[model samples]
Target chain A: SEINTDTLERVTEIFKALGDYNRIRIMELLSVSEASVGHISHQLNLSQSNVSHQLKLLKSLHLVKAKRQGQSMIYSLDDIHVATMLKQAIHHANHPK
Target chain B: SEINTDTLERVTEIFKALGDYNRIRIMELLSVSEASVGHISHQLNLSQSNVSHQLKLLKSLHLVKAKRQGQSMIYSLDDIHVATMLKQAIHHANHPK
Candidate 1:
């Protein structure tokens, strides 16, 4: 197996994006259903600005995608593999050794 | 879905550990086959001390495990899910949307 520098950087970027608690919650929320910034902010009890900031980070990494729905912007996991990775990480964390 | 603080911390720790390029390389190396500190250090072109340090971080999170193999310690991924997550993440990183 070969290790590409670009691959390492990309993966590291994704992990750094996920290292935040709010982003993790946002991801888990989006994993369940696509939600607008307001909806996510309300459900997570976070400010809309905070939610939007995290969403932007997630979007930059291609971890989440957003669409306009009238006055609200809806976000969802953009990459299937990212959602899978999050789920797997959560499962691994819960199940003890 | 509930967001337990403990779970978030654990997942964050794992991600933070993986955020490093050397650790990412170490993980990719281990995912291919279990290797000793010396082998990993050699293959990744990293110092033995650095590999050991990263291995300790991975060990603390149960992301990787180490065992006594004769005179050296063999390190490999502890959680199957983590390896799965890495593979999924790598796939996502490579196949841009």
Candidate 2:
């Protein structure tokens, strides 16, 4: 079956969002639970501003979602599909036996 | 479960490969069947040199693979996992109704 161009564009955005290592690390960290900008920046050794900037892009893409929790905004993976894709792709690429 | 760092890196590379619009379009075209560099360049309106560069990256990433067909080298998508991910993510993002 032919794939739609509009759909292809959206999927392309998702892949673009995950293209960076830092962003992928952020998502990996957020997969377990919601995290604040400070928590991610500190844990990942990225500047707070840099972490926030990446988080903002992730939020805009809907690959991540966020909400204010008192002093900070907590973020988490918006859906399980991305995590599932990451898992399967890594599995197959590494275990091509 | 926590993912391995090595696995995360590998998965990140796959996402990176699909991050570009032109690159994604190339894969989309190849999904149907193998196409030579000249055919891809002509069908996609890309310069032969430019299409060859993109195809080189795809081949390097193993996202696409090729074999010589007489004077032409025909390329095709290396695996279906990526196509499946692209389909599901696109479907979910657009059909949130």
Candidate 3:
């Protein structure tokens, strides 16, 4: 086996998390800069609660990270892998064929 | 909006196609090089029918592509985006945190 089963499973779930339209937009927002739930909600025109819910799910997958900036939680892509994945995915969508 | 909904929808579908464990393995196998249905099934230890079925779904998303060379259908990652997404995901899973 070239790749471990657990590793494959873990990565599959990450893709699963990425499969939603709303989440994709949220990720696109956060990919560029850290944002609070309110800011994300405003930028994407989604409800703040919805944004918070999506962030919770994304956190479980470790796709995004959060840090406290004063009272608000600032969020950004978890690491280079996540950022690269999101950036490439967006590029793929906008790519000219 | 900075990002269009159609593009987000398109990219999200690509991630949706990538979410399945079996599909992930199939894509992983094909990412390295082009392979026939039989070879992919044998390599992934999946039934030919299952591989064929998964390939159909992946093809709809343009995540993996195929061309008939003689009697056999050769398949590979659709393009750089699909390849990069899969590689980064695999790397993310194997990365030490």
Candidate 4:
């Protein structure tokens, strides 16, 4: 089979972006429920600044998106495919063959 | 929301392994069709040694597994979820919201 370099690079970029621990948890939190930076920070026991910083990186990759919710910006997984990937990744990690 | 650090680390390890361009392409190649290292090297324009090294990392992560077919070792995606995740990741990359 022929290799698709463009797709390969793009996929690699996404995975690299997700390879970080903070960002992965950000994704997991968002997948469970849409939450504000403050909520995420508190839940993950990280500072709000750290959470926002991680969210910014995730948004740049389109792994997550933010919407204004009154006084807060509610962040959520941007693509359904991301949620599917995350859940499957969890399954793959927990149940190795 | 609750944070699962063990799961986070496991998933991150998988993503980190996949984050490499060579590894991602290898996964794509395996998903399309199981092939020997030589075939993968030729298809991806990589050396057999390079392909073997990448395959070793993938195997350690359980992302791929090797089976002997005659004198050749055929490598394939070990987890269906990994294949599913890769396809979804590709789609996510190509189509942004």
DockQ per model, Cα: 0.71, 0.48, 0.74, 0.69
Give the chain A TM-score for each candidate.
0.92, 0.83, 0.93, 0.91
Report the C-alpha lDDT of model 3 over A12-87, residue by residue, as the tens digit: 9999999999999999888878899999999889999899999999988889989999999999999998898888
lDDT (tens digit, per residue) of candidate 1 on A1-97:
3348998789999998888877888898898899999899999999999998888888988999988888878899997797899989988988858
1 or 3, greater by lDDT: 3
Candidate 2 segments whose C-alpha is farther than 4 A from its true place: A1-10, A32-34, A67-72, B1-7, B68-72
Worst 10 residues of 1 chain B by lDDT: B1-10
Order candidates by TM-score, high to low.
Answer: 1, 4, 3, 2
What fraction of the true interface does each of the listed models get right, in terms of native contacts kept? 0.73, 0.59, 0.82, 0.86
Say which prediction, candidate 1 or candidate 4, comes out ahead on DockQ. 1
lDDT of candidate 3 over B68-95, digit per residue (tens): 9999999999999889888988988887
Clashes of 1: 0
10 residues in a row with least lDDT, candidate 2 chain A: A88-97
lDDT (C-alpha) at residue A51 in model 1: 93
Worst 10 residues of 3 chain B by lDDT: B1-10
* Clashing residue pair totals per candidate (backbone < 3 A): 0, 0, 0, 0
Q: Each model's TM-score?
A: 0.94, 0.74, 0.93, 0.94
Candidate 2 per-residue C-alpha lDDT over B3-97 given as tens digits, one digit per residue, 9 for 90 to 100: 67887787788889888888877887887668999999898899999999998887776678888889989998776775566555655566663
Residue A96 of model 3 has an lDDT of 71
CA lDDT, candidate 1, residue B43: 88
- For residues A17-54, could you state the per-residue lDDT of candidate 2 as single tens digits? 88888888888788766799999989989999999999
